[PDB]
Structure formats: C-alpha cells, structure tokens
C-alpha cells in the first residue's frame, strides 16, 4: 500500500504519508489533565487532551511531555499520543499501513523494544522499522557524505557519515536543547523582574524563545553594545496584551549552545563537539566532513547560528581548508522529509520487520534488523 512516516521527539510530533513533501499532521507532543475541580454539570469533562486541544485549553490544564531527552518516560500517556496520531489527525487505520519511527542514537534499548511491542500488539501494525534521526537528514539534504549536527528539543547529537557508512565510534551525543534553553531563558528573564513558573507559562517562554532570540556573530561585542545602547532592545505581547521589554538577554540565551558553562554543564559547545567528532574519524574522510555540515531540527533555526559556526569552526580549524555549513530552511522538517524518502525506496521494502518475524523471534529482532 503506502506507508506511514512518523517522528516523535520531545517537541512537535511530525507525521504524514510517505511520498508527501511535508507532514500532513503537526502538533505538540503534549498530554494534559485538568487540575481544577469540574464545576459545571454537563461541562463535557474529558479524561485527557492531546496536542492542539491542550494548547487551546492549557490555562485550565497542566501539561506534561511523555518524552524527555530522547526517552519515553511514561508509556500509557505516550500511547494516547499515538492513538490520536493515527485515528484523529490522520484518520487512517494502522492495520493497513507499514509504519516508520525515528529515534535518537545511543538511546536505551528498552525504548526501542517497548516501542516495537506496542506497535505490533496494540495497534496491530502490519510492519515496522526504526531509523536514527541523523541518517535521515542526509537523505533530506541530498547527500551521502557529511557530518550531521541534529538538535531539537531533547537530545542534540553529531553523527558523521562517509559515503553511506556511519562511524559508530565517532557518534557524539549531548543534551543541551530547546527545552534547556527554555529553562535557562526563564532563569535569565527572572533577572529583568519577569517570572514564569507553571507549565503553561513555560510554553509562553518558548514562544518568546522562537520569536525574539538570535545569535550574535561575536558575543562580547554585542554584550557590551547592548549595555551601551537601547537599540538592541525589543518588546513583545503576552496573550492578555500586557507588554514586556527584552534586552541584551535575547541573544544571551542561545549562547548557551556555544558555551554550556552558563547552564552549569562542563561540556564544549556544538562547534567543539563537532570538531571533536571530526577528530575521531580519519584524515581519509576528514576533508569531506569539513566540506559538509548539515543542520537538523528546531534549535538550529536561530537566525545567524550558521554564520557563527562557520566563523567558530574556521578559526578553530586548520587554516588552509574551506569550511562550509549547509542550512536548508526546511531543516525543522528535514528529519521527516528524509523518512518520506527512505520509506519510498524500493530496496527498503525488503527491510521492514514484519509481524511474522516478530512473532517468531520476539521483540529482540528489532535490534538485529534495524541497526
């Protein structure tokens, strides 16, 4: 038939039919419960809400993401998200449609196993496969060689690939991400005398992060300059039409990617973890990874992150050798688009795990076939 392609990270769920150019359903990966007494009789109380509805209702609700970093933490909530995905938004019965799922590399093994077990047992999915989110970005960006920086909510990781081969010894994984940029953004906003405590307020903070932040081509110059002048300031409206002024801080927040020390990590920023990934892989390869860097997932979209990396690698890198950084505007969706490609290759039809082989060999098969 034609095959479902689905992403869940700790941010937006991305799902659609394979062979489309963009996901047919996009909604935040949120499950929400009322925290107030139901007063009205005939209110039409509902035991939980999923996605966009929870975004409208959220004032009345409390909101919890079933996925933290890369990992599903609480499974029966997640199962509601899948149920909503297939039945409500796609409105397609999962019995007739092979399904494709994406994970971050170096995740716990249970996460992949239970994700299989649910799909076969609870949705009766005819066939399944699981793919690392980095790899798909190469199909999306049209390449078979490059070092893939992938960063969204949840996990941030570098995977190098050279002419179709991964290099498992050189996969690097990190956890600074849109969620922890968001918590930092709250903790810094507190210093201008504004505070957000509850989950629903956090999702106001996130919309600030998306709308106003940007990355400074050099950080101490703009830090000094914003003290020296208002002109960097900008202002934004809360839902109720109150207005807030935001400062030098609006660039200060995404700097934590380049300097993890601020959030309190000892780590080196995505530039240096890219370089340290290039080091682990041999000089046979290295020139062509320096020649291709591909960015995936939401956090990469901060305006000017690309130029800041091309500077901060090139100044770090060996001097003689061109450095190039490649940022399609799609890149928030590229991890899905590459699944739309991979699920529609004909060679891949051999590779689907199928119900028969699972029933023969148990869930354990998924590690053997998939990766």
């Amino acid at each position: 038939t034609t095959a479902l392609v689905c992403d869940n990270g700790s941010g937006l769920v991305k799902a659609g039919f394979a062979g489309d150019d963009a996901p047919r359903a996009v909604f935040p990966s949120i499950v929400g419960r009322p925290r107030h007494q139901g007063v009205m009789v005939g209110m039409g109380q509902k035991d939980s809400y999923v996605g966009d509805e929870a975004q409208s209702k959220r004032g009345i609700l409390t909101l919890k993401y079933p996925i933290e970093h890369g990992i599903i933490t609480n499974w029966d909530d997640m199962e509601k998200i899948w149920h909503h995905t297939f039945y409500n938004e796609l409105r397609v019965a999962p019995e007739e449609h092979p399904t494709l799922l994406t994970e971050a590399p170096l995740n716990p093994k249970a996460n992949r196993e239970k994700m299989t077990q649910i799909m076969f047992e609870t949705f009766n999915v005819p066939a399944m496969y699981v793919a690392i989110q980095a790899v798909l970005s190469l199909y999306a960006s049209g390449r078979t060689t490059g070092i893939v920086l992938d960063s969204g909510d949840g996990v941030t990781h570098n995977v190098p690939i050279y002419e179709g081969y991964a290099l498992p010894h050189a996969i690097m994984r990190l956890d600074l991400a849109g969620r922890d940029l968001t918590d930092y953004l709250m903790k810094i906003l507190t210093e201008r005398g504004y505070s957000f405590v509850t989950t629903a307020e956090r999702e106001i903070v996130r919309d600030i992060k998306e709308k106003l932040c940007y990355v400074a081509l050099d950080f101490e110059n703009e830090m000094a300059t914003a003290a020296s002048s208002s002109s960097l300031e900008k202002s934004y409206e809360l839902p109720d039409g109150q207005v807030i002024t935001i400062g030098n801080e609006r660039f200060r927040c995404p700097e934590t990617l380049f300097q993890p020390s601020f959030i309190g990590m000892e780590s080196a920023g995505i530039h240096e973890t890219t370089y340290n990934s290039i080091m682990k892989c041999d000089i046979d390869i290295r020139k062509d990874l320096y020649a291709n860097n591909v960015m995936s997932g939401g956090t990469t979209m901060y305006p000017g992150i690309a130029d800041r990396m091309q500077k901060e690698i090139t100044a770090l890198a060996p001097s003689t050798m061109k450095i190039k950084i490649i940022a399609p505007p799609e890149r928030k969706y590229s991890v899905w688009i590459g699944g739309s490609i991979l699920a529609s290759l004909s060679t891949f039809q051999q590779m689907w795990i199928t119900k028969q082989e699972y029933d023969e060999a148990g869930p354990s098969i998924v590690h053997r076939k998939c990766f």
Binding site: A22, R24, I326, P329, E330, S346, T347
Partner: protein
Amino acid sequence: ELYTKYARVWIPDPEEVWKSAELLKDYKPKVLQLRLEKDLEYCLDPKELPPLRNPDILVGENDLTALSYLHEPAVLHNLKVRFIDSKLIYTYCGIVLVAINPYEQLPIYGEDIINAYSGQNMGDMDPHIFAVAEEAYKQMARDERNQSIIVSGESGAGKTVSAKYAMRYFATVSGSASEANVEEKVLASNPIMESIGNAKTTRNDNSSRFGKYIEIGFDKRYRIIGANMRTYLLEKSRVVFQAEEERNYHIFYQLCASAALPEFKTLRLGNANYFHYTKQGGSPVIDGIDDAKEMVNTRQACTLLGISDSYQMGIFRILAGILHLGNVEFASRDSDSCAIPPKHDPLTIFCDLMGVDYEEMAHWLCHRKLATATETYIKPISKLHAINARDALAKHIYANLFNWIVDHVNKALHSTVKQHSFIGVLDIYGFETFEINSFEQFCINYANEKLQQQFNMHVFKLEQEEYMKEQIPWTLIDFYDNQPCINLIEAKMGVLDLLDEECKMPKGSDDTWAQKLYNTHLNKCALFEKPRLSNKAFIIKHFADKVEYQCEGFLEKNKDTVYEEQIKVLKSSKKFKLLPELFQDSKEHKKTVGHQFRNSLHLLMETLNATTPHYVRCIKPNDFKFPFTFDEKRAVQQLRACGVLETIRISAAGFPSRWTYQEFFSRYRVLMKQKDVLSDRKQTCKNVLEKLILDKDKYQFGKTKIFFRAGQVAYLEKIRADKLRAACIRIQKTIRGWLMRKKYMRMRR
C-alpha cells in the same frame, strides 16, 4: 531417415540467409555431400542437422502453418514466392495476417472485392485485409462484444494504408458513406498527428513514437455513426534530448523553417541549430523533404479539420515558447543555488510570448517552493535541478498541447448519437533494436513484449476452444508464457522500479543504478545478463532477441518532476486564450516518465482486454523502397521484429497441421491397399496410419479433423513419392522392354 539421396536442405550464406541444396548421398552417423542450383561439403558439429526443405506441394499454400517443416527458411521462401512471383501480398500465419508492403499500388483494394468477401467465412478465400475486417464486422453482429484490429511494423511498412482500407471496407459495408463520411476526416487528420507524433530515427526517417488508436461507433443498425480517437505511449523524453542523427518532433523544424515568413514575425525564430532542443542531433535536414512547404500542408490540415487560426497561431506561439525556454541558460551563484543573468535575452522573449511577467518566471525558475500545512518555505535549487525542472516543464507543456490537439480532433470527429457498439483499429511500433539501445527503446520493447503476452494468451485460448469442439485432451497442448520476462521489467525490484528508485536516492548515477541491477538480478535470473567487456550496460532476453541497453543516458531521461508554482505562472497569463486552457483538468507531477509510461500501457491493455483482438503485421521488404524488390536480410529482421517467427516457433511445438479425412484420402489412398480398405473412413485412417507411422504420440484422431505434429505430413508424402516413383519405374522399364522386343522383330525382318 528423412535425409536421403535426392532430398533438399538449406544452408547459411553471407548475402541471403538461407540457400537451397540437395543431398547426393544418404546421411548416416562428419560430412554432407551437396549440389547447388557448384558443389559443396557441409560439415557438422555440436550435434545438429540442417533445416530440411518441405515437399513442394505445400509451398505457396495460403497459410504458413500448413507447412510441415516450420522454420526460418520455409517462411522466407513461401513469403518470397508469394511476393515476387505471384504478386500476392497478404498471407496468414495462425490468425495473424501478414502484409508485405508493395510500393507499387494495386487493384485489389477496389470496391468490388468488398462485396465479394462480405458474406464469406474466414478460411474460404485468398487472404486480404478485407478478410480481417470481414471477421471483425461479422463477429460484432454474431455476438455483442467489441472487436479490435492491431497493426505492427516499422512506420515505413504501410500501417496507415492498412487502416485506411480497413475503414473503407466498413464504410462500404455500412452502405452509408454518402450519408456521412468520417473516412475523409479521419484521413485528413493524419498530417497533424504525424506532425506532433513523429520523429526521424536512425534506421528510418518519419518514425512514429506513439501508439495511436481509433474507435468507430456503429448504429444499432450497424451503419457507421462516427469515429473517436485516443492516443497512448507518447515519447516525452525526445522533446528535450536526442541522439545523434535524430531530430526532435517534426513541427519544431517545420516551424523554424518558416521563420522567414512575416506571419510568424514576432516569434524571433532562428535557423534550427540556434535552439538547444533542436540542435543536439546535428541533423537539421531530413534528406529529400522540404520542411518549409510541408508547414503549409500542416496548417491546411488543421484548417480542414476545423481549428480556427486563432488557435493555430496560439499553438505556434507555444512551440516558439518551448524553444526559447530551451535556450534559457543558468549560472551557479554558489554550488547550492543558481541565478539568471540580467536582461537575459531568451527568457526576456519567452515571457513576452507567454505574456507572463519577467520577475515571476525569474524567481520560480531559480527557486523551489515547499508548502507545509501551516507555513511556506521558498527554497533555492542547484543548476542541475533547475535544468531538470525546466526540461520537465517543457515536456509537460508539450504533452498537454498534444492531448489538447487530440481533444479537438475528437471534437470535430465526435458526432454524438447513441453508440451501440464499436470496432477499434490500432497502430503501434514494432519491437525495436539498434546498434545503440536506450530508454526510448527500453520502453518500446516493454510495450511490445506486454502486447505479445496478450497475443500468446489469446492464441492459446483460441486453440484450446478449438480442441474443445473435437474432444481432444488438453495435455497435448501447452501454453507458452513470457511472464518470466515481464516480471523482470514490470514488477517491483524490476528494471524500471530500480530506475525510479535511483531518481529519488541522493547522488544517484547511471553507474550506481547498473551496479544495483547486477546486485539484484545478475546471478539470479536467466533472462538478465551482464555484457562481458563493460559495466555500463545490461542485456535482457526477449521473445525476439537478446538486446543490450546502454546505461549512459538512462537515468537523466527518466526524471520528470514539475514544480506547481511554475505552471501556475503560465496558468495566470491573460494574453491569449489557449495557454490558460492547456493545464485545465496534483500527484502526477511527481511521477517519473517510466511510471507514467507503465500507467499509460496498463490503460491501453485495459482498453484492449475489454475486446477480442484481431491482428495484422506489416514488413518492409526492402530498405530502399524499390517498387518491387525483396531483400532476404531485411525480411528476416522484420520477421523477427514483428514476432511472426516466435508465433511460428510456438505453433511448431503444437499440432500445426490438420486434415479432413475425405480430403486426406484423395492423396493417401494411393499408399493404401483397396483389398483391406474399410467402409468407414475414420476407422480406415485409424487402421492405415497406425501402420504408416510408428508412434501414437505423433498423431491424434478427431471427429472431423486429424492432427499431425510438425514432421509427419512431409514424411507421409515422401513415402508416397517413393512408392509411386518405384512403381513408375517398373511400368516404364516394362514398356521399354516391350518396344525393344518389337524393334528386335524389325531386326529379324
């Protein structure tokens, strides 16, 4: 054995394929001793024995299957001695009517013969094209079902003459042409569809590149009502890319030849090598044809078939658009984007011919748009992608202009009155191979091979229904099935499917495509082979031949993808009526040309499997159009291409020769002792044949017909000829002795 003294065989020769000879000595278990109508020794190796010449009564009968030794030399010979000596041009094999095109026109199409066939049954006449129409038009009365006629050959071989007379026969049997004639209008349609349809291929000029089907409605009275057209299997790849010694579709040249004329002054047409789509073949002139005159005959054909010149000049405006679009030239600003230089001349003109503003076409040609559900991204594309999209736009324009011209040729032809039932007449190109083979040939070969599957299935069903009548078991007759090849080309993990995968897969290339072919099939399958000296090609076995396809251009030609926002720019144009029309009523924009072809092919066969087809084949008996000559190499190549020799090789495993007992006796009783011979004919032959032939597998007795396998009518007539010849010896010598005795009495005197 069969090979005695004074028996005849064929041998291979450089200038004609088989040559006749005679055995001077019997064979015995190496050298063979031969005489040539010079003397020769012909010598034998792994072990095999030559083709054995048929007895001489059978040569020249109406039907090649009547021959006992069915093989290439006999088919060659019997066609030759019809065509040159008899000047009979039509022949039967199975049901499959062969037609060998004379360039000399002939009486036999004349109207009397129409009346003479119209009542008669299939086998009762000398074969002729009216003998096919006679069946199709009878069958449509006798039973409900629609009937179709199928015509195959090189486009030089008289297909359209066969269709024209096929229609004439219907129009006269309907008695109705005076009431209205479609026939004039159908035949006056031909120049337009030739002009859009055809190209100059290496092995012949004015090759046609599309399957063309014409559907003719009847009254409940079965007079003609009207005619409807359809078309299938158009070659889109040619419009933008061409091999050396080929041209683009004829109109582009007939247009460029007219650049001098003030009628088209606006278009700024050049000489044909100016434009990047026309020049690539290096071959602007078709030998012996003026283009500039023929243009006028095209326009007049459009006028006669009812297009107002308001449309005709719009058509030519579009074509000039396609050419100026062709000359549009990109530059790379950086490896992952492209741009168009300022005031770039051809795009400047193109935007005026279309009446779409400059800036929109500039923007969308350089940029792709991706729309998600919530939001838009406008996205740059690399020079390669830009060129691929421009050429896909050109192909999509041309295919829509073609479908529109067919829609109007219908609109003129498509009288509307309730249509009781219909007969169909179809032209297609034959199986096709050259020194080079390429994606065009690959698709043409897949279309021929999947029609061949239908034909073989129908012939098998029709013999099974024949054996049904005479209570013969099925095990004797065996279906022959080329599903094993089609499952190679068509099915998933096919050659086409793996190509459509390489179109998607990033940094695809013809080399990696080929390497995936070899990985998939090469050891597995008997029909796929790697050519030894190269990794740039692959071989596929077919019914006719092994064929070697070059990878070299094969992925580039497969890509079709058209960006919606580019056609929307055209669709907005105010300036003239037609271009907003062409695009009127998606997912198809993604479909690669291979997939679009495989779909059009299944739509064709779903149009034919509704129907009970008849067949024609046309062969081009000399390469030079001599008024009469026959050239035995060319007739061989044509008889492979049409697949007649496979129809024969299939039937020669069969029971290809049948006799009615009362006809059988007239020759065979001479073998047969009257002293034994019974009162009851079927018992008579059952007794006698069991003596004359050793094995009960070789023959079958049926109610009215007796069946023989391939070899045994020849053997039976040989043993007749020996027995009769020996008796004739004994009489002749006895008479010579008697007269010599009388002469000796003269000596006594």
